[PDB]
Design a binder for this molecule. Structure first.
Ligand SMILES: NC(=O)c1ccc[n+]([C@@H]2O[C@H](COP(=O)([O-])OP(=O)(O)OC[C@H]3O[C@@H](n4cnc5c(N)ncnc54)[C@H](O)[C@@H]3O)[C@@H](O)[C@H]2O)c1
Ligand SMILES: NC(=O)c1ccc[n+]([C@@H]2O[C@H](COP(=O)([O-])OP(=O)(O)OC[C@H]3O[C@@H](n4cnc5c(N)ncnc54)[C@H](O)[C@@H]3O)[C@@H](O)[C@H]2O)c1
Ligand SMILES: O=C(O)[C@H]1O[C@H](OP(=O)(O)OP(=O)(O)OC[C@H]2O[C@@H](n3ccc(=O)[nH]c3=O)[C@H](O)[C@@H]2O)[C@H](O)[C@@H](O)[C@@H]1O
Ligand SMILES: O=C(O)[C@H]1O[C@H](OP(=O)(O)OP(=O)(O)OC[C@H]2O[C@@H](n3ccc(=O)[nH]c3=O)[C@H](O)[C@@H]2O)[C@H](O)[C@@H](O)[C@@H]1O
Lengths: 314, 314
């Protein structure tokens, strides 16, 4: 088929394109405006290989300015990953690009998909929509975001449901849980903490470090994401959690990084940042059932992979 | 005490201001940018009756072009009604004004209220957030909007929760159910059908006319809205349905209108329009407990009042 990947030069999008291109029967169109928290230099690195592949077409344009008629011509599947993704930087004057790139972009894509015959529109969303929840969260749980970011991503999900129900756009929603590994964005905790540790600079901890995440290794995330395309079973209209092998606190992670480096971290404990939950924890039963999803990369292996990537990057 | 009412020149806002001005204790500031579906001619008359009262101050400005710090210094309570409200006109290129005036306006007001000492931030929302549900809907039900309009309004609610949890802004959310009576917007069903019936023209019905609403008479809406200010109970953080005395389908309303006009209407059944639920039905248990809310205006009395107003307007 022809598969459109929005946000193709980003962390997850770059990996997803590479995975799809291993199947000789797939042709990939990647669109990326090179905005958000990752510098354009890192994004060029993410796609340099991809651009050599003859079955990849790269478009460096804003989805809000591009000819969406041309873009979606003969597209069989859309993977919509384009977004402004930072939890902590979505307040005051920094909110507008979240609304433009998370809400207006999703709506304009969904409008463009009304007059074409997609197999699937695979919309990427976030554990950030759940907000502050206790236990493993299931996809039927009432979402109450804690960040303006989370609000804009949940508005994107609701636009998906509006366009599915009214115009039969074949939407599938994936909710990722804190994805890490090679090419992780430089605003995320593991990139920052590894870069700090490499430079013998203080590790920046927001609050006391006891907060936990369901960290998902990139290869696990991509296996789940590709499974959503490749299943022959009806998952249209479904919201599916994609979570990781092993939860950990930021203190637990730092201890694991010290074992990889053989260094001892200097720690700087900052104020908690408004808008962050203290815990995330996916119930991935539905992904297990629908996609045969099971994450297999341990934090020790995934963290070594990221540490190696960050060291070579800088 | 001093009360800011956004969207003060609008249908519900103008009636709200009118009700608050009856209390000589209350100083009222109205702000309205004269946008949305109602032509500015009808809104002028709204602010003209309000401006007879010395305790009313009117600001004719976009909330996005206002010094909100300056405005809010002496404000005790905000009623936030300003929005783009039409369910049916929120598709395609019409969507952006809903994002601007429903999402960016709400965010920017909440940002300005972060360091104000408010008693209450009373955010007006809509039954449109629920989408299609069976039975009387309670406020803890998972909302799945059917329209882009509904998505933008539920995004505003989510912003209220974010700013409440992170910054202790004392938000209360009211979900209104299809409000009618004198001053009803010309794009709403009762206004169009009464105008049509008055001029012996076909009554335009969008589908089979079996659609029903929990229609709320304006005076009932306003009594519940004023109760949110005056209640003895703690309602900070609550979502509260404000629904009407009697549910009806459009066919029923057309029969009730024939009784009032003494006319037999010609019907013009048109294609159902995307993004509209078939039923709305409020569980008003919570309003009854927290606000002593009981709607008291019957459809026959309310339609008569709206009939007399439409007759007078044209
Ligand atoms: N990284 C995670 O932990 C994680 C977890 C949950 C969900 N998500 C979601 O996964 C997706 C990918 O996240 P990521 O970490 O790869 O982020 P990223 O910033 O690395 O990638 C997103 C890409 O979208 C592009 N983009 C944004 N707006 C655009 C526009 N208007 N037109 C064209 N391109 C545009 C950016 O240039 C960027 O390269 C996002 O939707 C994010 O919300 C990520
Ligand atoms: N009418 C109903 O049946 C109903 C039911 C549910 C909820 N609501 C909600 O009630 C509120 C009032 O609805 P209404 O029927 O009175 O609508 P309306 O259009 O009569 O009034 C809203 C007013 O907001 C003003 N406004 C919009 N954007 C603005 C901005 N940026 N700055 C300043 N003013 C701005 C408009 O000029 C308009 O006069 C809305 O929030 C709507 O979503 C209405
Ligand atoms: O799962 C998700 O939906 C979200 O996951 C991540 O968001 P976040 O959980 O903030 O991921 P990190 O940035 O890796 O933060 C993880 C934890 O580390 C903490 N942190 C972060 C950065 C840092 O320098 N120090 C620090 O202690 C944060 O407080 C947080 O508790 C992504 O950045 C989002 O794009 C995505 O939506
Ligand atoms: O309750 C709500 O939350 C919403 O109520 C109304 O929206 P709507 O329910 O569309 O109200 P009307 O415009 O009065 O429409 C009611 C019904 O009449 C129908 N209709 C409308 C107009 C018309 O000419 N003919 C007709 O049959 C519609 O299809 C709908 O089923 C308001 O317009 C919204 O601002 C508000 O958000």
């Amino acid at each position: 088929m022809k598969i459109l990947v929005t946000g193709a030069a980003g962390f997850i999008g770059s990996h997803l394109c590479q995975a799809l291109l291993k199947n000789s029967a797939y042709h990939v169109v990647g669109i990326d405006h090179f905005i958000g928290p990752t510098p354009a230099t890192l994004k060029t690195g993410n796609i340099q290989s991809l651009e050599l592949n003859s079955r990849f077409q790269f478009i460096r344009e804003d989805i809000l300015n591009t000819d969406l008629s041309k873009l979606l011509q003969d597209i069989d599947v859309v993977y919509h990953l384009a977004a402004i993704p930072g939890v902590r930087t979505s307040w005051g004057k920094d909110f507008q690009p979240y609304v433009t790139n998370n809400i207006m972009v999703t709506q304009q894509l969904l409008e463009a998909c009304k007059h074409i015959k997609l197999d699937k529109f695979i919309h990427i969303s976030t554990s950030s929509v759940y907000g502050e929840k206790s236990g493993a969260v299931s996809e039927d749980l009432l979402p109450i975001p804690l960040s303006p970011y989370g609000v804009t991503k949940l508005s994107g999900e609701h636009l998906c449901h509006v366009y599915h129900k009214n115009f039969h756009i074949p939407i599938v929603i994936l909710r990722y849980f804190t994805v890490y590994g090679p090419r992780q964005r430089p605003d995320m905790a593991f990139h920052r903490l590894i870069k700090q540790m490499l430079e013998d600079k203080p590790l920046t901890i927001f609050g006391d470090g006891t907060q936990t995440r369901d960290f998902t290794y990139i290869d696990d995330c991509i296996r789940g994401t590709v499974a959503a395309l490749e299943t022959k079973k009806n998952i249209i209209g479904e919201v599916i959690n994609i979570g990781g092998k092993e939860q950990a606190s930021i203190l637990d992670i730092i201890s694991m990084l010290e074992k990889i480096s053989g260094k001892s971290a200097t720690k700087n404990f900052l104020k908690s940042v408004p808008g962050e939950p203290k815990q995330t924890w996916a119930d991935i039963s539905k992904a297990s059932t629908l996609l045969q999803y099971s994450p297999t990369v341990s934090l020790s292996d995934g963290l070594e992979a990221e540490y190696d990537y960050i060291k070579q990057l800088y």
